[PDB]
Design a protein around this ligand. Structure first.
Ligand SMILES: C[C@H](CCC(=O)NCCS(=O)(=O)O)[C@H]1CC[C@H]2[C@@H]3[C@H](O)C[C@@H]4C[C@H](O)CC[C@]4(C)[C@H]3C[C@H](O)[C@]12C
Ligand SMILES: C[C@H](CCC(=O)NCCS(=O)(=O)O)[C@H]1CC[C@H]2[C@@H]3[C@H](O)C[C@@H]4C[C@H](O)CC[C@]4(C)[C@H]3C[C@H](O)[C@]12C
Lengths: 129, 502, 502, 129
């Protein structure tokens, strides 16, 4: 083990307020619906959760682009065949722990809804949290 | 650390066991290595490889695998720790997951290993990753003499290994699993110790191969050797056995049954090339033979050529009563032969000029010599079915069979060089493995040829649990070994375990 | 009770052992029987008989004899108890004395047994006599893998037994010793368990005799039987072994070496009765033979008659090169024979009419048949010394050898009844006992022939630690047994242990 | 200097009790025998105290195997020509401080007396302290 690496990229205070989950949609669905309290307890790998940065990539390439949903969890992508609806936030871990000799930086943004899909150049991915 | 409730061990199983027996408190102190709990991550491995997969029991500890013959049951957790040998300049992860005691089988992709209660360990960690191995069960306790379904640890390569490598070796990151009983391991009920348990490692006979006996031809064994030139995957039918004690094909227990048959004498004279006897085969122990799984009665020759049985001839002609004549038998096809030992009939022909007044009885045959010997399956049926043992393989890239060559009596008319028949296991191992009936643990033993006088290795071979020895040879010339050593079992290895080049 | 000081166990051995290891506390609860700790006092015994004599160790308890492979040492006392089975109308005493761990050997008269710290027990006691077995020692602890000198319990018949007896049985007073560890028994240092220990009971191969191979003639075994008519004390030289793994005489490991020899071909033509070859014997493994302890090279035949080896004949005469001719050899004296295998020379004679152009080389011989077979030692030397295995005995009154009869190829001119050669142990046991090398505990095993299908006994025989089986037969007619069962070791017995009549 | 190495392999609590040295053999020898109090003060290299791990070695090879004695000290191997006897423990330092790029692990066991000499495979060297 050696600490000639970066210790931790501790989530900066991203400029965003807290958002309500199932507390807004609860008096508008006609059921009491809860999911296993053990699904909230471990981080399991996404269905689309595998990328790679080679040195043939250029600045601006989009490494991953995944919309908040139940498609971000093998558990909830399976539970979401029985239900019609969802609300709430998710917590994502990003595991890049490259060699001690590599160098480079990725930037992970928080693109809001209704923002046009497509290009999203490198000059404008920083204007988001 | 891990998302599991604490699992009650000997407190759930206590009100229903006659006793709850404690273990030496000096066994909860040491981390002893788990069998098959070793791996190695090369930079050529793809993520998804399964490095180890080992099930909670008392078979994980040599102390407990031995204490668990005095008792009936067990309960409780274990503590395992994974040590990894990588420096600060590696990069890669390894996910160690607790698989519940069901959840059948199949290719666990790396998408699915992170769904169990797991731990994700970087390759470049310093101190050994400690993690529990809980006893999730449907029953109160477990029975020591009956392998059951218990919690597994499965290790998988999550992201691949990125390092440099000089020119040799290629920097594999090694790893080893070591376990000890948790604070609440217990055995259940003291019984009298039994010797034929299931955690009883395969031991080999202490007999030099030169003192052994051959398996395909009834002679001593005169040399063990590798030979990348001959057919690398033969289909012999004698000297085939499973390390778990199952005889494969026409392999007999005894060495007197090899290349021999007890037959029914059906004699009748003929004025052509001589006397011809049709033999109705039976099993040499005197039991009625029926066409079954074997391709011939037990011990019938498995080579191709001109074999000559002897006798049991009682002659009522005056002058002599019991003599020893030499018949002749053809084993190859020759496109003219009614050779069908499968159905229980063989044809033997001696070149006689007059009538031999031979009583019909029960005979048994002994080989005398062979003419035109070819390493090729004989005609167990004319051109028909033969339920037979499969070929002898497969081997890893760069591994060649280790053959126990003996020399058979050759009838020759053109040369004098002795011919070499050979088997995979001398007839002492075929009796040992059957008389013990061990329990196969994984896939392949790991023998070690040593010299008893000097005390130095000769090679490290690999006994597959299918009954043949392989050996990682690089060159091409037949390399013959001394025949005065001893085979010594080291441990169980997987199939893909790569030997050391001889 | 007994005049001894209390003997410190694990408190003297503690400051010099790395560990002091505890034992399951449920082992200090049960009285488990001691091996060889049983006797029986008939009214025909004279005072002075020594009923049992057993030495303090961990070999007295099946729990500890098994726990004592994980460890290095032991220390401490044991509690034994003697139970006696006699009613209120018997009369007689038995003195149980604590013999110190030296005090060499010899006939202890009843005058001398009362001089140790002892206990004098009437035969008609009710509750079991409990007495200690202290660990008097010169050293701090003991080593488990090396039998050493420890305190003995010796039991002696002090005054004889006076009872009535109906007509059968004759009222023997039985007695049994049962031991458990005292409160301060301890093992010393946890090692990895080893399998070749010294408290490892003799186990036998699980192989029916019909599947075995004979030891004196290379053939299967066709019937095991008793026969009070033949020589009760033969002096065979093949199939002799010690249960502790020592080969006696000319017994080989392999079964291919039986009735065979590898010789030097010294060929020369003669115009008398035919061709005669003088063979310079060697050991069939290819090692230089010198006259030593054995009466002949390993495997040379041990019967008397007219044997006919085959060949290794390379003929340089045009037409054929390698053939298989049949020589002839005389084993009995016949008063005209230069038969001396001891010194390494044998004479073989074939009846040929012309010259056989045979190259001189290295041959090995295979028997073909026998003419005039007599169960009698051959001429290993002309009329000279033969360091040979002693006869096969002695047996108790009313016990007859159990022979493994096979039938050899007979050349006859007067009858056709098959002749029966026989040995004491089939060639599978001769290899088993040598490959394991057990530790002989007393004097004689106690086998038990069972049937694997049915599950009922056939007889109880007795394997003496000298390598032959006895059986208490009363009648006189040859009684033949089934040959489809399994031998099962029960326990060690003394010599004088009287079997059950078959 | 760099600490991308392993800090110290501080002797784990090896499972073994303390053992008495000259306090047991003192009332059984007829002399008062002491050795220079400065010999106990520095670590000097064994007579058999030099090994090497190459990459041509395989797992299981025995790197060193040295019985407790006076042959473990140049001082005491010299003093032991005047005496007939010894008792007591020794303290051994093991100096492997390989490069920052190497990788591998050795395991040092404590084999008791009377244990049979010879093979000592790798599966069973861990069953000892
Ligand atoms: C013809 C046999 C004599 C032995 C012989 O000829 N050669 C032995 C050496 S070799 O292999 O020929 O090389 C005789 C003697 C022993 C006999 C056998 C024995 O009597 C045992 C059973 C008894 C059954 O009633 C009949 C089948 C049988 C199996 C017999 C077959 C056959 O009659 C045998 C085998
Ligand atoms: C004459 C032998 C051929 C085998 C044979 O003739 N019969 C085998 C069956 S049977 O028993 O005759 O019944 C030849 C082939 C194998 C040879 C042996 C082998 O070459 C092994 C050693 C090698 C040494 O250089 C010479 C002695 C020897 C021990 C050889 C003796 C002899 O030349 C042998 C034994």
């Amino acid at each position: 083990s050696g600490q000639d690496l970066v210790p931790a990229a501790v989530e900066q205070a991203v400029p965003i307020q807290p958002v309500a989950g199932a507390a807004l949609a609860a008096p508008a669905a006609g059921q009491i619906n809860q999911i296993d309290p053990w699904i909230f307890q471990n981080f399991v790998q996404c269905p689309l959760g595998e990328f790679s940065i080679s040195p043939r990539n250029t600045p601006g390439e989009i490494l991953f682009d995944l919309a908040l949903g139940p498609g971000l969890n093998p558990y909830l992508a399976h539970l979401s065949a029985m239900y019609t609806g969802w609300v709430g936030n998710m917590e994502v871990q990003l595991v890049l722990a490259g060699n001690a000799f590599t160098a480079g930086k990725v930037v992970v943004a928080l693109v809001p809804p209704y923002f046009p899909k497509g290009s999203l150049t490198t000059a404008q991915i920083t204007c988001f949290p | 650390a891990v998302p599991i409730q604490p699992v009650a061990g000997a407190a759930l199983a206590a009100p229903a066991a006659g006793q709850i027996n404690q273990i030496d408190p000096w066994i909860f102190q040491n981390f002893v290595q788990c069998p098959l709990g070793e791996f190695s991550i090369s930079p050529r491995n793809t993520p998804g490889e399964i490095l180890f997969d080992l099930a909670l029991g008392p078979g994980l500890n040599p102390y407990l695998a031995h204490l668990s013959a005095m008792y009936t049951g067990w309960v409780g957790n274990m503590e395992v720790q994974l040590v990894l040998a990588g420096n600060a300049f590696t990069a890669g992860k390894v996910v160690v997951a607790l698989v519940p005691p069901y959840f059948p089988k199949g290719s666990l992709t790396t998408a699915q290993i992170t769904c169990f209660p797991h731990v994700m360990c970087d390759v470049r960690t310093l101190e050994p990753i400690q993690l529990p191995l809980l006893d999730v069960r449907r029953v109160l306790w477990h029975a020591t003499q009956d392998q059951e379904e218990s919690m597994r640890l499965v290790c998988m390569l999550y992201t691949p290994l990125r390092t440099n490598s000089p020119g040799d070796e290629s920097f594999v990151v090694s790893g080893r699993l070591l376990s000890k009983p948790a604070a609440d391991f217990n055995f259940v009920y003291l019984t009298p110790p039994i010797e034929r348990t299931i955690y009883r490692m395969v031991d080999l006979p202490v007999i030099q191969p030169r003192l052994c006996t051959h398996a395909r031809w009834p002679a001593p064994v005169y040399g063990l050797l590798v030979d990348p030139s001959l057919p690398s995957n033969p289909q012999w039918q004698n000297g085939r056995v499973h390390v778990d004690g199952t005889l494969l094909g026409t392999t007999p227990i005894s060495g007197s049954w090899v290349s021999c048959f007890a037959a029914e004498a059906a004699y009748e004279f003929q004025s052509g090339t001589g006397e011809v006897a049709t033999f109705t085969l039976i099993e040499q122990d005197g039991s009625a033979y029926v066409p079954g799984d074997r391709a011939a009665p037990l011990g019938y020759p498995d080579f191709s050529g001109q074999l000559e049985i002897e006798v049991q001839t009682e002659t009522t002609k005056t002058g002599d009563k019991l003599k020893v004549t030499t018949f002749e038998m053809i084993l190859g096809p020759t496109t003219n032969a009614d050779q069908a030992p499968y159905q229980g009939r063989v044809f033997a022909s001696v070149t006689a000029a007059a009538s031999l007044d031979l009583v019909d009885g029960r005979v048994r045959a002994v080989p005398r010599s062979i003419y035109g010997f070819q390493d090729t399956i004989p005609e167990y049926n004319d051109g028909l079915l033969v339920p037979l043992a499969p070929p002898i393989g497969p081997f890893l890239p760069g591994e060649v069979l280790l053959r126990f060559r003996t020399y058979m009596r050759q009838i020759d008319t053109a040369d004098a060089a002795a011919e070499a028949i050979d088997c995979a296991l001398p007839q002492e191992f075929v009796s040992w493995f059957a008389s013990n009936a061990f329990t196969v643990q994984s896939e392949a033993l790991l023998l070690r040829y040593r010299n008893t006088l000097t005390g130095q290795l000769l090679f490290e071979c690999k006994l597959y649990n299918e009954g043949y020895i392989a050996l990682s040879y690089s060159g091409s010339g037949p390399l013959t070994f001394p025949t005065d050593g001893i085979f010594e079992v080291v441990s169980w290895v997987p199939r893909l375990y790569q030997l050391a080049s001889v």
